Every structure is written in C-alpha cells, then in structure tokens.
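Here's what a typical entry looks like (lactoferrin-based synthetic peptide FQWQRNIRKVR):
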Amino acid sequence: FQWQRNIRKVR
C-alpha cells in the first residue's frame, strides 16, 4: 500500500 509510513507499525 502507498501510505506515508504512519499506520500503527508495518504489518
């Protein structure tokens, strides 16, 4: 997925 490195962790 093309996100800006800030969901929760990585998985």
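The two ends are 11 Å apart (CA to CA).

More examples are in the samples folder.
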